[PDB]
Design a protein around this ligand. Structure first.
Ligand SMILES: [Cl-]
Ligand SMILES: [Fe+3]
Ligand SMILES: [Fe+3]
Lengths: 136, 392, 515, 168, 130, 392, 74
């Protein structure tokens, strides 16, 4: 869980300590990451979704989820994938809420995002390149 | 400098925001955040429609379903309660049970009608720019449409006014919303018919969009004699608000109004080259089906199947249906005399065509309403009764 | 012909359709109102704000999109829902839900006006009003809905439509802007709902309150309420047209002055003490003395611009105005005594005035410190706020002869031994029933029309019952099932439970047994 | 003394047992007419079930109404009172009754008693509502003639109250 | 200055207010020739306040007083107040009918109406006055 | 406790708000509050549409109208500028002059289409509930509408993709908005045709809403041979972005597109009892008139009457019109062969009725376009050329 | 037929139309890009966010009203 924090790793260092890690020889190339980042802009519907979906069943299924308060938006980072079922959110909100309505406040994604039925999903998988590990 | 103090905003004034932050507890004082959580959900989850509507009416426990107690604080001279059981013959274990399947509280209702309002004006500006009125049959336009579709506005207007006592008398919040939205849609129908007439007058020199000829036809032409008599009875002859809603929407408008609007003017528009009227009948027919959804829930789901008063209620509904179906058959029998004025089109305005139209209207009605309250009806008998008024 | 036509782009504007509305009616013998009325004069008037259904929907939807954008996007992102002073957040449980029933009853009253109107244009205008009062019902519901989601105390915001039934203040609300509108003369609704209700009292109740909301950190209520009132100008204009019809006919104008005075007293009797109490005691930061608010909106502006101007045409200044003005100055302080003393019957958390509040009350109402202030400070000494004290002030009132009475007509509580507002107790027996009346205007109403005024009061329903049992039965608890929704303080600690109430041993008396 | 709970108590339970034993339209009509005369309006005979009579009356109405639909022909539901009287004759009789009233005190008792006797389900709803409306019009107009003309002291005498207390 | 929110007796406080408030001549209403207009603050309304009401409006009616009441604008004047939506539309640069103007016209003390593109609240008693 | 700082809001935090209040000047530093006040307004006062749109494109002074200076920072391989005068033959003194008369920036555009989007689905849910499909002529429904209206979507779709290079190449902001909004309306039309077919499929057992038959007809049926040839040329044969917009909307779509959509499918729907299609063509025709207002302003007000290049531009517009009108006349000549497959209706599908339809299309086009650029055209000659393809 | 039909309320959802978008293209010799590119590889990919013009407008209009409400009102 901690490794997905906004200020994880080198972001804890300050002053010369940060500079030495930032300019270290091993950190002059990118490093593959299994994570995804999801940004949701704060609103009535989104704040409900954060509290009762992402911070409960979502973190239950994916305990590596980190949710940070960035004033105007929510910053979420997790290993592997993050999913939000617009059907679950509509049940919680008590009003019409398709997957198209959920995207109204889905602000940004770092990873491979897509909608499938009522579910929005952002995943580390490289669809079209990664080969399916099961025939199911 | 103004005479009154410029009030500092507690949200943004640093001194007042600091005072407020010191007073606000650092934790919530209850975790139940669902507004009126105790409402019994009709669907799998409680809807915002229900939260905003349900139990707004302050009924006491002696009006079935109410959560309050005691007598009203002020009653009519004589003793008539603010709301009371004397307002209708029908009975139920809970007047709050009704739910509009479209879940219309005020905002989604005006939101949807705003779309139709603005798109309508964009369509008319383009339709006039298109010149598409050039291909409409002139006799249909001048002698059938302008006069008898215009006269039909008075049927929609009378059905609209039938809801005035319903808006006052009815016994729950969701019923009141269902009733008032239905009334606006009816007066909308009347205003949209007059809008189409005013619009054609801008395109056709000599086309008179005055309501004089339509009104004379509604009040004196035998074609609308049965229809006007029915509307006058539904609107001003009764005050039982369930009788008004049922007779208005589930019988009269479901048979006569559906035939006039959909089978005659909408269908024959697409036989006489009328590219304008279908845009307007599309709205009245959309409103009808939305109104039917809610009317059907009130009378079928709630009242005709109420666990204690279902059969009791079906007795009154069957008596009303008998009366107002006879009124509507008579109205339709008068109305079909108008086919003697239209150009013959095989399968449309000949006896076979009219017969199949009445078979749809009465057949659909039997499925949608008659079968659901236990009212036996011979469709072919009602079709043949109307065809007695058709000039071969 | 088939080739040549004017292809200029044209539509049809709302006033082009509205011009033909009056012709939509037709004459038949039965075409008359179904409701009893004294007014049968000519009423073929013209609408001052021409609307049709499509244009009605467009206007209101445009208002809504902005309102809900502000609520669900902007104010939510700011966390504005929990930036309200607790006193004010608690006050909006009462103001919004109580006003909601006024709006809801206004739907029915406007339908009576719709039914009694004879001209098609007025029937069209009153339908728009009926629609607006539905809109306002859902707007008031939406405020408490929003508070339930974002404010630190959702209890009471989230269930007032049943928990209001526990307490005495709700009874009077069911008359002031409810039963008083819909249970009587239909055409008279143009006088009591509109000429008085909408043209006089909605302005302080719905507009002025938004400045108190702002002062105390609430930007939710101004967003909604200020949109609510935009609809009111059609409503006033609707009522004014009918009042001109009544005044122009001598037969109907002979009823107008009496109906105006009863309407004004009926509404001010409750509105004046309750709203003044909610403003001054249900706030931290105060905008102005309530009596100055009353003077500005009720006495000077409505009294002058509507009733004073109509004095040219035989409409008299209400005879009850002097008594009303006395209520504007003291009645809400009287009411505060009842409200604080019987706090467990409400659904809001209350705060005794602090030292800054007390100095403000005394500077603006000289004499307040020695009468009301000393009582509030004694209750605090006795443990008013402390759940372990076993102290509820209603018992203290009774133990010192300060009985609380309920007006049979208006339902407003009255404490004759402590009140400085208008009132004197009258107790009559009639056909074996005792009745307590509290002023000359309501006593006349009850003497003339006893069958209109049979409202059970809290003492008659609760007689001999212990306080915690009434509260529990009425669901006056939070989700744990034990902690009271209502509280005698606004802090987050030391909340009272049913057991804390039980220790006080408060049992409801029969206040009229002594007569 | 000590009231029972509001919505479920021994007084309502006991009365629901009496109501369940009604078996005919004639029997439940006399039951509901006697009840409304005994327990409703300012001229009721007894306030002994004051906080319960409105709920109890609702339950009598429900019994009479189901008995009407079970036992009566449809034409009777529309055109007759459950007393057997012609509904339109009831309307004409009571309207003329109140129009002949010589004072607001006669007119008020006529209107109140009409409701005690003919409140639905006794009279058909449509006939009842227009009759009650016609009566209220008469009662309102006579009560609002010189509304402030009689001093409170005089009104107290005309009403016949026992004045138990007047604050100084 | 007589149209200010705190004009007249509203300047008094404490006992001085009570003595005026309970004075004998002030137990009956007094005919006023004024109108009160309330406009809820919005982007559109605020531009109208600054560039219409407080300029051409006050030049035409110097008795106009505009007061800041946090969430709304409070306006009082002698006789009448008028706002032309066609003028406001040219000011805002977007379509703006008289129906659109009323979206943020919150309250009225006086006889209000629309006639064409203009909105008016007036002291005149239409249907009673000549 | 999250790893990163929970940032205090300067609007609500007492300390930061007090710091900001101290730094904000007690007076405005300028009185000019009109965003881009220097734009020359087309109408009485500057519109918000102009404020938000005009001069967004950063053109230099060597592209007529540009306020900037110098060469682009980076160009194509070879030297093609980011935007350049080589992109079109037409010339002007100011490429920014264009104004859409509907004043559509992005928000009013999607606002309007959202209204149509939501209302369409309410209309369909109600139309299916009405069962109104029951009175449509089956032969029209199955053999003409499904197949040839289906095939027409490819014309709309091709016209949509013609805008792709226009969206890249055109030389000003208001023009780019006009082009892109016109492109979405075209692909909307194609998608709406498929929506109606998919809708009928849910209502009529056996009705096949697959695009296989429409696509085969579009690509191989002689009825669409000339139409497909023109669309392919306009879309992929040229890159002059003014030629694309002119040939697309002002010649081909204004002649062939208007005949197919309005004179054939919309008009005849109201002859063969089709109460569904007029709802869909009501949208395409509205879109056409909106696009025309913008296209009319660009080529007539701005280009054909540019103070310095008016006659210069009319030389190219006349050469293009000569070419693409001939292409459209051939398309129309192929298309009217479709009347050989429809049931004859006097005054609509006979030779007389098709002639009057062609007179409306060519007559309206002469007034709306040809007359405004000085293009000489004999209407009767163009009508007779197309009628040569009509099987009498 | 003329009397019998399924009157169940139905519409057409955006993914039902989107399913047929790929078939809207037809083959002809000049159906190629106008712009210089080094990349000439096969690119018959599928969209991840199915949208049609009507649904595009609904989504963005909904975003706009919330944004412009916040700005112009609150
Ligand atoms: Cl002065
Ligand atoms: Fe209201
Ligand atoms: Fe109102």
């Amino acid at each position: 869980s901690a490794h997905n924090a906004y200020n994880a790793g080198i972001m804890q260092c300050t002053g010369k300590a940060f500079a030495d890690e930032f300019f270290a020889e091993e950190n002059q190339v990118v490093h593959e990451s299994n994570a995804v980042v999801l940004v949701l802009m704060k609103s009535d519907e989104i704040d409900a979704i954060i509290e009762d979906i992402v911070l409960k069943g979502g973190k239950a299924k994916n305990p590596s989820i980190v949710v940070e308060d960035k004033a105007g938006f929510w910053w979420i980072k997790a290993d592997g994938a993050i999913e939000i079922d617009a059907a679950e959110a509509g049940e919680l909100l008590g009003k019409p809420f398709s997957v198209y309505d959920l995207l109204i406040n889905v602000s940004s994604t770092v990873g491979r995002a897509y909608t499938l039925g009522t579910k929005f999903t952002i995943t580390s998988e490289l669809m079209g390149l990664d080969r399916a590990l099961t025939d199911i | 400098p103004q005479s009154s103090q410029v009030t500092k905003r507690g949200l943004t004034d640093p001194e007042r925001a600091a005072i407020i932050a010191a007073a606000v507890p650092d934790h919530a004082l209850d975790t139940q955040r669902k507004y009126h959580y105790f409402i019994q959900p009709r669907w799998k989850r409680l809807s915002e429609y229900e939260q905003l509507s349900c139990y707004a009416q302050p009924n006491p426990d002696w009006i079935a379903g109410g959560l309050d107690w005691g007598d009203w604080t002020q009653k009519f001279h004589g003793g008539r309660p603010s709301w009371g059981n004397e307002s209708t013959e029908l009975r139920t274990t809970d007047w709050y049970r009704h739910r509009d399947p479209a879940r219309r509280w005020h905002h989604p209702y005006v939101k949807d009608k705003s779309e139709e309002a603005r798109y309508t004006q964009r369509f008319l500006a383009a339709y006039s720019s298109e010149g598409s009125i050039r291909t409409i049959d002139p006799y249909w336009r001048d002698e059938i449409l302008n006069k008898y579709f215009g006269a039909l506005l008075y049927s929609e207007y009378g059905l609209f006014n039938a809801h005035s006592s319903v808006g006052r008398d009815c016994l729950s919040d969701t019923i009141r919303q269902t009733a008032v939205f239905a009334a606006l849609d009816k007066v909308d129908n009347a205003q949209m018919i007059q809008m189409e007439r005013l619009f054609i007058a801008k395109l056709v020199p000599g086309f008179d969009a005055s309501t004089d000829v339509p009104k004379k036809i509604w009040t004196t032409d035998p074609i609308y004699s049965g229809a006007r008599a029915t509307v006058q009875e539904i609107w001003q002859g009764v005050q039982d608000w369930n009788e008004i809603l049922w007779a208005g929407h589930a019988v009269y408008d479901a048979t006569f109004g559906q035939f006039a609007r959909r089978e005659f003017f909408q269908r024959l528009a697409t036989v006489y080259g009328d590219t304008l009227t279908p845009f307007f009948t599309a709205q009245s027919q959309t409103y009808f089906q939305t109104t039917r959804g809610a009317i059907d829930d009130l009378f079928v789901y709630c009242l005709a199947n109420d666990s204690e008063f279902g059969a009791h209620n079906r007795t009154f509904l069957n008596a009303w249906t008998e009366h107002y179906l006879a009124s509507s058959v008579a109205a339709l029998k008068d109305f079909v005399g108008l086919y003697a004025k239209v150009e013959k089109v095989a399968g449309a305005t000949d006896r076979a065509g009219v017969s199949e139209a009445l078979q749809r209207v009465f057949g659909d009605w039997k499925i949608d309403y008659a079968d659901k309250i236990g009212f036996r009806v011979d469709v072919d008998q009602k079709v043949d009764a109307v065809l007695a008024g058709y000039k071969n | 012909d088939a080739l040549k036509v004017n292809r200029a782009p044209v539509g049809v504007e709302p006033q082009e359709v509205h011009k033909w509305l009056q012709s939509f009616n037709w004459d038949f013998k039965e075409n008359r109102t179904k409701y009893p009325t004294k007014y049968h004069m000519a009423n073929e008037t013209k609408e001052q704000f021409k609307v049709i259904a499509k244009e009605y929907a467009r206007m209101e939807a445009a208002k809504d999109e902005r309102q809900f954008g502000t609520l669900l996007d902007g104010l939510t992102r700011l966390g504005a829902g929990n930036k309200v002073h607790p006193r004010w957040g608690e006050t909006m449980k009462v103001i919004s839900n109580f006003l909601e029933v006024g709006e809801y009853n206004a739907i029915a009253a406007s339908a009576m006006l719709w039914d009694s109107a004879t001209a098609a244009e007025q029937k069209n205008g009153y339908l728009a009003q009926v629609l607006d009062e539905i809109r306002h019902t859902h707007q008031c519901a939406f405020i408490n809905h929003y508070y339930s989601k974002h404010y630190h105390d959702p209890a009471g915001h989230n269930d007032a439509r049943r928990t209001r039934a526990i307490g005495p203040l709700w009874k009077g609300m069911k008359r002031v802007f409810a039963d008083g509108f819909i249970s009587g003369d239909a055409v008279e609704c143009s006088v009591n709902l509109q000429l008085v209700g909408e043209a006089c009292f909605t302005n302080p109740l719905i507009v002025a309150v938004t400045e108190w909301a702002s002062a105390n950190g609430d930007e939710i209520t101004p967003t909604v309420f200020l949109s609510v009132e935009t609809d009111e100008l059609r409503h006033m204009a609707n009522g004014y047209q009918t009042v001109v019809s009544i005044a122009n006919d001598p037969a109907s104008a002979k009823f107008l002055n009496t109906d105006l005075n009863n309407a004004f007293w009926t509404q001010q009797k409750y509105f004046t003490p309750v709203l003044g109490y909610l403003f001054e005691y249900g706030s931290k930061f105060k905008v102005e003395p309530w009596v100055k608010t009353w003077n500005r909106w009720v006495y000077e502006d409505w009294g002058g611009i509507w009733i004073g101007r109509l004095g040219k045409y035989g409409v008299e200044s209400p005879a009850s105005l002097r008594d009303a003005k006395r209520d504007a100055y003291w009645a809400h302080h009287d009411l505060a005594l009842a409200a604080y003393a019987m706090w467990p019957l409400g659904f809001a958390r209350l705060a005794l005035p602090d030292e800054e509040d007390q100095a403000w009350f005394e500077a603006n109402y000289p004499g307040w410190a020695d009468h009301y202030g000393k009582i509030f400070n004694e209750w605090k000494k006795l443990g008013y706020e402390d759940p372990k004290s076993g102290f509820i002030p209603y018992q203290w009132l009774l133990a010192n002869g300060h009985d609380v009475y309920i007006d049979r007509v208006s339902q407003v509580p009255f404490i004759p031994s402590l009140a400085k507002g208008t009132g004197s107790l009258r107790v009559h027996e009639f056909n074996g029933k005792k009745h307590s009346l509290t002023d000359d205007w309501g006593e006349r109403q009850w003497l003339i029309e006893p069958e209109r005024y049979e409202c059970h009061n809290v003492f008659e329903q609760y007689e001999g019952r212990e306080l915690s049992e009434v509260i529990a039965e009425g669901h006056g608890v939070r989700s744990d099932g034990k902690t009271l929704i209502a509280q005698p303080h606004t802090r987050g600690d030391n909340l009272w439970t049913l057991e804390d109430i039980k220790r006080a041993g408060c049992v409801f008396p029969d206040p009229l047994a002594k007569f | 003394a000590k009231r029972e709970p509001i919505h479920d108590n021994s007084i309502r339970t006991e009365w629901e047992a009496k109501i369940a034993k009604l078996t005919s339209v004639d029997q439940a009509t006399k039951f509901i007419q006697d009840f409304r005369l005994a327990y409703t309006s300012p001229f009721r005979k007894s306030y002994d079930i004051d906080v319960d009579y409105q709920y109890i009356e609702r339950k009598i109405e429900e019994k009479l109404s189901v008995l009407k639909t079970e036992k009566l022909p449809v034409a009777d539901l529309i055109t007759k009172a459950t007393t057997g009287e012609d509904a339109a004759a009831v309307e004409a009789t009571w309207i003329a009754k109140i129009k002949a009233a010589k004072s607001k005190y006669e007119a008020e008792r006529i209107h109140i008693e009409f409701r005690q006797l003919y409140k639905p389900p006794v009279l058909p709803v449509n006939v009842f509502l227009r009759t009650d409306a016609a009566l209220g019009t008469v009662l309102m107009e006579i009560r609002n003639t010189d509304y402030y003309g009689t001093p409170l002291e005089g009104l107290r005498k005309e009403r016949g109250v026992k004045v138990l207390h007047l604050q100084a």
